[PDB]
Amino acid sequence: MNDVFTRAIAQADLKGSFLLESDLDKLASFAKEGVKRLDAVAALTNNAPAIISDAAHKLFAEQQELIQPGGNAYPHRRMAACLRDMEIILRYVSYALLAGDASVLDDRCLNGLRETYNALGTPTQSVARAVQLMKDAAMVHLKSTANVTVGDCSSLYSEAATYFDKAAASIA
Amino acid sequence: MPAVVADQYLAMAKELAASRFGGFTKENIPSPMAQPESYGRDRLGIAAVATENPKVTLRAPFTSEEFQGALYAIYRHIFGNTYVMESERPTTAESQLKDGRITVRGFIRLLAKSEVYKSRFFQKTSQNRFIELSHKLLLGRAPYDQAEISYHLDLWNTQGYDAEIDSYVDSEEYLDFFGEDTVPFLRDFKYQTGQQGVGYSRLLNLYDGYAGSDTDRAQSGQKARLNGTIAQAEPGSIERPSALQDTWKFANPNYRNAKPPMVKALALEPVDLLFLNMAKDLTSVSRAEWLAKSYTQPSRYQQTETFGQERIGAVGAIETPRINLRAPFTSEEFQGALYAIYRHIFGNTYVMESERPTTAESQLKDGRITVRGFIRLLAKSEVYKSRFFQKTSQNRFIELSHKLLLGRAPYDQAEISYHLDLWNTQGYDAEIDSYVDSEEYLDFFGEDTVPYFRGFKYQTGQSAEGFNRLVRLYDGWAGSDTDRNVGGQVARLTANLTRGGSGLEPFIVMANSRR
Amino acid sequence: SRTVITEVIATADSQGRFLNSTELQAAFGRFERAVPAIEAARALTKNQDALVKGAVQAVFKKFPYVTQPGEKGYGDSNQAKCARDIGYYLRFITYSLVASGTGPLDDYVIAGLREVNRAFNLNPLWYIEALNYIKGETGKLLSGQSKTEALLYIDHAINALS
Numbered sequence A: 001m002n003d004v005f006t007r008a009i010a011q012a013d014l015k016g017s018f019l020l021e022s023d024l025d026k027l028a029s030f031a032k033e034g035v036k037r038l039d040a041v042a043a044l045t046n047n048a049p050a051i052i053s054d055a056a057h058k059l060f061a062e063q064q065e066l067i068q069p070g071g072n073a074y075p076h077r078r079m080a081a082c083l084r085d086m087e088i089i090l091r092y093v094s095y096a097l098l099a100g101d102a103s104v105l106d107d108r109c110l111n112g113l114r115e116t117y118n119a120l121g122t123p124t125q126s127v128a129r130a131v132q133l134m135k136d137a138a139m140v141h142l143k144s145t146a147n148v149t150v151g152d153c154s155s156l157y158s159e160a161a162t163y164f165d166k167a168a169a170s171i172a
Numbered sequence B: 001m002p003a004v005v006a007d008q009y010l011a012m013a014k015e016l017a018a019s020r021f022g023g024f025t026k027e028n029i030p031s032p033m034a035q036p037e038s039y040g041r042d043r044l045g046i047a048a049v050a051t052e053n054p055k056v057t058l059r060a061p062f063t064s065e066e067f068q069g070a071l072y073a074i075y076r077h078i079f080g081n082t083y084v085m086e087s088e089r090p091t092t093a094e095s096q097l098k099d100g101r102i103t104v105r106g107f108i109r110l111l112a113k114s115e116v117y118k119s120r121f122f123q124k125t126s127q128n129r130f131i132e133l134s135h136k137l138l139l140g141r142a143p144y145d146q147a148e149i150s151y152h153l154d155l156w157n158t159q160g161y162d163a164e165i166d167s168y169v170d171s172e173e174y175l176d177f178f179g180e181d182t183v184p185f186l187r188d189f190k191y192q193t194g195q196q197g198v199g200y201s202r203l204l205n206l207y208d209g210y211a212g213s214d215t216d217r218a219q220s221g222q223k224a225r226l227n228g229t230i231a232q233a234e235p236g237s238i239e240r241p242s243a244l245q246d247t248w249k250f251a252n253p254n255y256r257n258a259k260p261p262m263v264k265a266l267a268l269e270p271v272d273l274l275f276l277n278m279a280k281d282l283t284s285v286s287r288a289e290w291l292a293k294s295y296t297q298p299s300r301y302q303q304t305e306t307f308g309q310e311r312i313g314a315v316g317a318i319e320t321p322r323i324n325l326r327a328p329f330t331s332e333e334f335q336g337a338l339y340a341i342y343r344h345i346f347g348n349t350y351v352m353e354s355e356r357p358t359t360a361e362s363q364l365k366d367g368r369i370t371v372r373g374f375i376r377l378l379a380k381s382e383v384y385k386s387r388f389f390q391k392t393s394q395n396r397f398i399e400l401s402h403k404l405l406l407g408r409a410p411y412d413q414a415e416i417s418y419h420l421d422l423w424n425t426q427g428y429d430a431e432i433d434s435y436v437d438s439e440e441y442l443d444f445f446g447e448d449t450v451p452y453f454r455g456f457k458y459q460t461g462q463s464a465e466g467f468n469r470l471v472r473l474y475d476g477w478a479g480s481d482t483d484r485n486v487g488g489q490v491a492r493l494t495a496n497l498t499r500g501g502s503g504l505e506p507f508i509v510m511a512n513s514r515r
Numbered sequence C: 001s002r003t004v005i006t007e008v009i010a011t012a013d014s015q016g017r018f019l020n021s022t023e024l025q026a027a028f029g030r031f032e033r034a035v036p037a038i039e040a041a042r043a044l045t046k047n048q049d050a051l052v053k054g055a056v057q058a059v060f061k062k063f064p065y066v067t068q069p070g071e072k073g074y075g076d077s078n079q080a081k082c083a084r085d086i087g088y089y090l091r092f093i094t095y096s097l098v099a100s101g102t103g104p105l106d107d108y109v110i111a112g113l114r115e116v117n118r119a120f121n122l123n124p125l126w127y128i129e130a131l132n133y134i135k136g137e138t139g140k141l142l143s144g145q146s147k148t149e150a151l152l153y154i155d156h157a158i159n160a161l162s
């Protein structure tokens, strides 16, 4: 697990010299925008139940075979497992968003997750769909301009989109 | 009516539908993916070690059977699933456990330091294999990171074997999950607060089934199986043993997956994906937004709201303000109303300062006459007569007075006959009073509003030609009804009125048939 | 369309006179108010999808019954038309904001509104609910004057519906 700064440092170390002025400008700009980044991570953290309820409702509307006898979210145990997985993946996406890098998400969360779901008999495409729906709800909450100073945050929205899309692509 | 089916089949249908709540509905169908609740752990063969075997806990006081079962579980977990012979059984350690000198944790520490554990999992192994085994048997999980292997290899190299075993058993993870009293169990088969994506797969790789074991007596030896995958940060293998292939064969987890077509569809003429793009636009997305955006597509008619009024040249004549002049009014309101009145009632023709009626304006200023009475005076004036009466035919005067005083064109030839007769028998003034005292004039203009062009909108009772006739009477905003044109002041609507139309309608009806 | 400049020109033209100080000052007021109005229209455009979806769901919340089968709010087509209508209203409100006059709303939505709603059995209360919604969120999307112009135009549409 490394952030944007440790990523830059590792790339510099591989070639084996100091961080260039362009690299330091990039990282200083990142730290300057880190306040907006904190706002985005707070948006994901305070609205997790809303995001995951919305995603689950949409997912079991589109895919009814999941919540009906025989389905992979049928009894309370597997339904709870599904909502738990949604919580987990949202959590790691917010971690990566704070880090400014997707190393925590990939290394700690999504690495053996497709293998786990394949061994359990869980539709990885349904899981990816759930992550997409959860991305959409999360993006609704991130853009919220209430309680927070107004300003451009398009880079943050795009970055959160890449984190969710990477999660989906890794699962499916 | 005779019975259509035999009663046995009716009974069978009734009792099939009786075992459903709601019988047979579309909402209460079984899932096509026919997975029991225990589908996953049964097909993986981990049902016993993950859900069925209880967590064995031993406290300070206990009976004989509790002690013996605890010992059986301990030996079946810590020593892998390998047969420990009676000569190998540790007696003093379990006497200390029985006394209460050591906890179950202390017993695990002793056993992992014993020659049984070392002979099985240390002396004929790599250190990688030893660390895998010790994570599995002592921490109930598999190593997550290569840093763990580096840490444990360095710890054994510097401080020895027992420091390694203590790092396992004294770890906060071991005490969080097992404390001092419950035997360690495989614990990454259920999600816990500190798990990682690779953990499930790697534990599955390390676990060889209930009848499998971690024995050095394999002909290939005691070999590491996670040494290459932990280094490369890969998941573990999820291939399960061969006796589980018959388990839950009829489940269809990959139900949503689409079967490919035998041949990709092409569109030879306009390119080779318009069918694929059409199918992605048809089914891949929900119907609601599909219709929503189809509704708001621009039309092939590129027609603004003023389109149609611009074509006939009547946008201004339609949108100009309606001047209403009350009894009390200011100078600006009065002069603007005068301007509007002279522009309409004199047909956009220039009236010089000498021709303007001062006495009539004064009477209107005082309130002696209304706007209607002013209009009546104006239309009786030599200005109006000389422009619209004296150098004209009566047809032109009648269409022109309709246009100027009613804001509409004649609707039929009966109006022409009526007005010609009225003027011929009573004179010009009576004929003007016919327009100004008409119910139409009072219902639309009514004593206070300047006349405006009414016939660009549908009027009740209109003849479907009065619109066309007002268009043919109107010459745009900069057109006038002057008598100073080269030919003179000549009629416009004589043939259309008398005929009642163009005379091409029967042939239009023919044309709308065959050809 | 009836806007400040257009009514200026039309009133001067109806009296056949040039543009004097009164009308030039009205034009000046319009040109000064353009900045708040144009950036309010910018804000409303940027958030059209969320506003329309929220308005449709607000209509379904205040009028649950329409959602049931057999009446107006049922079916994919009917709800797509709800969304299209609410988008129409928002579009012409932004138009009026930009043009600094109720002209676009007057000529595109308000002229002929009652006849059309009556003919197609459309409740003005649905659209009033949607516009009250849009009003509520345009409150928090906008600050200062821009909020003011946006709400004058939204309330003009609401008053036209009632």
Ligand SMILES: CCC1=C(C)/C(=C/C2=NC(=C\c3[nH]c(/C=C4\NC(=O)[C@H](C)[C@H]4CC)c(C)c3CCC(=O)O)/C(CCC(=O)O)=C2C)NC1=O
Residues within 6 Å of the ligand: A057, A060, A067, A073, A074, A075, A076, A079
């Ligand atoms: C195997 C055992 C099992 C049970 C028991 C079970 C219950 C259950 N009911 C659900 C939906 C629901 N269930 C209800 C029940 C309410 N309806 C009201 O009329 C009543 C006051 C009340 C019932 C007494 C409602 C309203 C919902 C919809 C909630 C939502 O919006 O998602 C859901 C959410 C998933 C879905 O959308 O279908 C579950 C998991 N699921 C299971 O797998």
Ligand SMILES: CCC1=C(C)/C(=C/C2=NC(=C\c3[nH]c(/C=C4\NC(=O)[C@H](C)[C@H]4CC)c(C)c3CCC(=O)O)/C(CCC(=O)O)=C2C)NC1=O
Residues within 6 Å of the ligand: A066, A072, A073, A078, A079, A081, A082, A083, A085, A086, A088, A089, A108, A109, A110, A113, A116, A120, A122, A123, A126, A127, A130, B037, B039, B040, B041, B189, B190, B191, B195, B196, B197, B198, B199, B200
């Ligand atoms: C820290 C990172 C991490 C993650 C994310 C993780 C996920 C995870 N999900 C699991 C089961 C599951 N996961 C799901 C959820 C899926 N199935 C439903 O159909 C949905 C389509 C979909 C969710 C949107 C379900 C239903 C199960 C239970 C399957 C079974 O027990 O047969 C399991 C097996 C153990 C258990 O049942 O608790 C793991 C380890 N584990 C981790 O260590």
Ligand SMILES: CCC1=C(C)/C(=C/C2=NC(=C\c3[nH]c(/C=C4\NC(=O)[C@H](C)[C@H]4CC)c(C)c3CCC(=O)O)/C(CCC(=O)O)=C2C)NC1=O
Residues within 6 Å of the ligand: A032, A035, A036, A038, A039, A040, A042, A142, A143, A144, A145, A148, A149, A150, A151, A152, A153, A156
């Ligand atoms: C408790 C952790 C924490 C939070 C929550 C936090 C919020 C925070 N947001 C700020 C400004 C800001 N916040 C944002 C972010 C918003 N812009 C858009 O509306 C987005 C919806 C949204 C983010 C995606 C922006 C653009 C600014 C102005 C730029 C700046 O001052 O840095 C500021 C600087 C003071 C101010 O201008 O008001 C703080 C302290 N800081 C913290 O240390």
Ligand SMILES: CCC1=C(C)/C(=C/C2=NC(=C\c3[nH]c(/C=C4\NC(=O)[C@H](C)[C@H]4CC)c(C)c3CCC(=O)O)/C(CCC(=O)O)=C2C)NC1=O
Residues within 6 Å of the ligand: B081, B082, B083, B084, B210, B211, B212, B213, B215, B217
């Ligand atoms: C789920 C219940 C369960 C089963 C079924 C089970 C079977 C089992 N038998 C084993 C060894 C063995 N099994 C046998 C028995 C076979 N060899 C002879 O030829 C006979 C023909 C035949 C028996 C009829 C032998 C000889 C060994 C020892 C192999 C060796 O040490 O080289 C082992 C390896 C344990 C170790 O050596 O540490 C297991 C796991 N264990 C279990 O926990």
Ligand SMILES: CCC1=C(C)/C(=C/C2=NC(=C\c3[nH]c(/C=C4\NC(=O)[C@H](C)[C@H]4CC)c(C)c3CCC(=O)O)/C(CCC(=O)O)=C2C)NC1=O
Residues within 6 Å of the ligand: B125, B126, B127, B128, B129, B146, B149, B150, B153
């Ligand atoms: C008990 C018997 C046993 C041994 C000896 C053993 C070797 C071993 N060497 C390791 C790493 C390593 N080994 C080396 C040494 C090599 N690289 C240098 O260039 C040299 C060419 C060469 C030494 C002459 C290095 C540099 C690492 C760290 C690799 C890395 O972090 O990428 C590791 C992983 C732990 C770690 O990353 O620190 C093991 C387990 N494993 C065993 O079970």
Ligand SMILES: CCC1=C(C)/C(=C/C2=NC(=C\c3[nH]c(/C=C4\NC(=O)[C@H](C)[C@H]4CC)c(C)c3CCC(=O)O)/C(CCC(=O)O)=C2C)NC1=O
Residues within 6 Å of the ligand: B348, B349, B350, B351, B477, B478, B479, B480, B482, B484
């Ligand atoms: C949309 C606003 C509007 C315009 C523009 C307008 C133009 C206009 N000029 C007219 C007459 C006229 N216009 C002219 C002007 C021409 N004489 C030439 O020497 C010059 C080169 C040229 C002018 C620069 C003249 C001389 C007449 C009188 C024709 C006549 O008395 O026979 C007339 C007929 C009215 C009448 O003759 O009493 C109109 C309608 N009227 C309007 O309501």
Ligand SMILES: CCC1=C(C)/C(=C/C2=NC(=C\c3[nH]c(/C=C4\NC(=O)[C@H](C)[C@H]4CC)c(C)c3CCC(=O)O)/C(CCC(=O)O)=C2C)NC1=O
Residues within 6 Å of the ligand: B393, B394, B395, B416, B417, B418, B420, B421
């Ligand atoms: C002020 C200048 C002026 C004149 C004179 C004029 C003539 C005139 N004669 C008309 C009708 C008529 N005119 C006549 C006269 C004919 N009957 C016999 O055939 C004779 C050969 C002939 C007369 C000697 C008749 C019969 C009508 C009735 C129309 C019909 O046939 O329905 C009409 C149509 C309106 C109406 O029916 O009363 C006009 C406008 N128009 C004018 O603007």
Ligand SMILES: CCC1=C(C)/C(=C/C2=NC(=C\c3[nH]c(/C=C4\NC(=O)[C@H](C)[C@H]4CC)c(C)c3CCC(=O)O)/C(CCC(=O)O)=C2C)NC1=O
Residues within 6 Å of the ligand: B307, B308, B309, B456, B457, B458, B459, B461, B462, B463, B464, B465, B466, B467
């Ligand atoms: C008494 C007999 C009579 C009739 C029937 C009549 C029709 C008539 N229809 C008109 C406009 C119109 N009529 C229509 C209707 C047509 N366009 C739509 O696309 C449909 C294809 C179609 C109806 C099914 C429309 C849209 C207009 C407005 C066109 C415009 O203002 O540019 C107008 C122009 C005045 C106004 O807009 O109020 C007339 C006079 N007039 C008459 O005096």
